[PDB]
Write a protein that binds this ligand. Structure first.
Ligand SMILES: C[S@@+](CC[C@H](N)C(=O)[O-])C[C@H]1O[C@@H](n2cnc3c(N)ncnc32)[C@H](O)[C@@H]1O
Ligand SMILES: C[S@@+](CC[C@H](N)C(=O)[O-])C[C@H]1O[C@@H](n2cnc3c(N)ncnc32)[C@H](O)[C@@H]1O
Ligand SMILES: COc1nc(-c2ccccc2)c2cc(Cl)ccc2n1
Ligand SMILES: COc1nc(-c2ccccc2)c2cc(Cl)ccc2n1
Lengths: 380, 380
């Protein structure tokens, strides 16, 4: 009855994640001045370049050069020896106003509660009781391994570390009446960019002793656990120099690590009218509310929208057999407790607040008691 | 016991899909001259611009301006009245060689069968017996609605159509011992870019009569079916002018429309050593082989890799309760029948062949008897 499952995460300096953080730094800069800014900011990163491309209609006066460079500085790319430098990189801007055809069909002359979805699409929310934060253990451990690397880099413990990293965790689970129970860690992968001076054996020993052992409980690790530490053997070239990054290329890292489902929409660089983000956050909120409310142990929620229409086109619930209530009954509880119009979600989840850059690394879910992580008390 | 499920698709002129097709046109151009080209081509599209960013090491001599412009011409953006023109757009190239650190860790001095995975990651394959092509009905119908729009545009039936479109289909299903049975179409959305002269009522009537009725069997449509046709009310501005596109931003449209699972990796612009593509194609091949082989009615396959390591780190099978065999037994059949090393998948699926641009619109699965769509006869 056991099986393996794998999830990955990436560090703050992974080039796709750099793009997500810059896109959300731009969004936050606009929201600080104009809470009703319409933002759809994509970022591309390659050797020496940050390009912003997209559509913004806002009353804010934003200094893109400063916002971009400050986000790159925060990540840690501050010298050409690291392959990228916020002080000296090229920042190119190809931003236009939001299409007037979209604006007229979505929000112009609309009451805020009755604003239309900013696009069509489908979105999922997921929650599992296998961890207190209601997230899959595989993804939680993968994120914590990247956060540990960043901590040891920033505190000077492992000064050879650079910001670009990837991790991957394979857990052996037991099936339990639809719920899943973690047994042990089967395999861990860590790849991290490093300086030219450190040797492979020093890195592998540090990754095991100072990173894995500092994150993964010893009860999950045994003589059979497989470790792939710096498996490529050399990772000096990294960040955008090693691989082009784009916003919205880590959507599974951002969500549930392969568990649940995904509707395809990226989160970063988008204001609340883009249901790709707001409805995915609301769906997580619903799923977590169902699990923390004791209605099920594991649950998947789907919602969908049409551009210009406020109410969802569909809502579906899948409880994996982990509820005594039928899926039809859970759907009725959801419909009685939640209003998934984007103009209502914005109020419930305070989505005009400029906290988005905080979401753009280490996953959008299962952390920091964001509004979508605080369960709603259900009435039924 | 019924539920709703929604999937979407996009047209050839949707800006993200333009990027996927250009990335795969570049890949195919290199493979035509150098079957061992190492390609990681990302494309960005915004008003008047195609930018190529990424890493290519190849012996081919490729004219990027010609390859890009020919792909845009094929899509149909050939005049400034349509918002984009292959003849006059800007084509910018920011392509470098593949990182030597990656090359040495993945393929340099390696026997082809024993080449390492080009990155870490997780990938899923999925198959369902609900259609002959073993794909979810929601996604099949959504893709066919975009293909119909392109057909009617190209044959001059609806000369007001432009290349950028999106569709979305909600189906009401019945649960059947883990398998799913389509009952009826609950909701359809169609949004398509159009000329300045056609009125909304003419478009809505044509979308219902000439598009939906030409694609969706009447048995699925009834008096209760909801139609959202041109729901924004106006879609003259479109293509990259309306919304920035990027490669690998339609990964759910490319795969299973929300069904199954996704590991996060994009397909387009990558050669076979990038397991994001080759292992996802092999996982589809495994899943389809299990369903067509009569071992299950519905199945999800996960595989994962570490950069530089040839064999998968994990393989998992989930049959939704649709097999008499346990998941452990199906996993043993898979392990006896398939070799999921990338240097073996390349041979089985003929992945050096330049057919990739054909995959980059209307989904990578369930069409045209590509090698990953031809089931393997299983021995057990
Ligand atoms: C391996 S690269 C992707 C493939 C690459 N575009 C190519 O040209 O082959 C993907 C991610 O892996 C990481 N990476 C880059 N260079 C690496 C190296 N030498 N060893 C391990 N991981 C590396 C970085 O996080 C990078 O964004
Ligand atoms: C609605 S746009 C995304 C949001 C946009 N970036 C913004 O600035 O609000 C996403 C996709 O919807 C389609 N689209 C663009 N303009 C549209 C319109 N006026 N009505 C309906 N769909 C539209 C195109 O396929 C486009 O790529
Ligand atoms: C026990 O639940 C469960 N769920 C899944 C699952 C994961 C993601 C999306 C949908 C289902 C699963 C997947 C594999 Cl490959 C193997 C065993 C599994 N067991
Ligand atoms: C009967 O199978 C099934 N599967 C799913 C499912 C879809 C994608 C990924 C994993 C599971 C499902 C999802 C919803 Cl929201 C509602 C009912 C459902 N029924």
């Amino acid at each position: 009855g056991t099986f393996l499952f794998t999830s990955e995460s990436v560090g703050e300096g992974h080039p796709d994640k750099i793009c997500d953080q810059i896109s959300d730094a731009v969004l936050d800069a606009h929201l600080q001045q104009d809470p009703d800014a319409k933002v759809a900011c994509e970022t591309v990163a390659k050797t020496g370049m940050i390009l912003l491309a997209g559509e913004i209609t806002s009353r804010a006066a934003v200094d893109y050069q400063k916002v971009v460079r400050e986000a790159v500085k925060h990540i840690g790319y501050d010298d050409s020896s690291k392959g990228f430098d916020y002080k000296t990189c090229n920042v190119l801007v190809a931003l236009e106003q939001q299409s007037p055809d979209i604006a007229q069909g979505v929000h112009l002359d609309r009451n805020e509660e009755d604003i239309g979805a900013g696009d069509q699409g489908l979105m999922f929310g997921y929650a599992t009781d296998e961890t207190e934060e209601c997230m899959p253990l595989t993804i939680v451990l993968a994120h914590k391994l990247n956060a540990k690397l960043a901590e040891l880099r920033r505190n000077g413990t492992l000064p050879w570390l650079r910001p670009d990293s990837k991790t991957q965790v394979t857990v052996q689970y037991m099936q339990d009446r639809g719920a899943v129970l973690p047994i042990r860690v089967h395999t861990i992968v860590i790849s991290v960019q490093h300086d030219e001076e450190v040797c492979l054996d020093e890195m592998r020993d540090a990754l095991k002793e100072k990173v894995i052992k500092a994150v993964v409980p010893a009860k999950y690790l045994d003589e059979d656990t497989i470790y792939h530490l710096q498996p490529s053997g050399r990772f000096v070239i990294g960040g955008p120099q090693g691989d082009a990054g784009l916003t919205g290329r880590k959507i599974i890292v951002d969500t549930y690590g392969g568990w649940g489902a995904h509707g395809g929409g990226a989160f970063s660089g988008k204001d609340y009218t883009k249901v790709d983000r707001s409805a995915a956050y609301a769906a997580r909120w619903v799923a977590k509310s169902l699990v923390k409310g004791g209605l099920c142990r594991r649950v998947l929620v789907q919602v969908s929208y049409a551009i210009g229409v406020s109410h969802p086109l569909s809502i579906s619930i899948f409880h994996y057999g982990t509820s005594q209530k039928s899926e039809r009954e859970l759907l009725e509880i959801v419909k009685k407790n939640f209003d998934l119009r984007p103009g209502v979600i914005v109020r419930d989840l305070d989505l005009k607040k400029p906290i988005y850059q905080r979401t753009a690394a280490y996953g959008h879910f299962g952390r920091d008691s964001f509004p979508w992580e605080v369960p709603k008390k259900l009435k039924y």
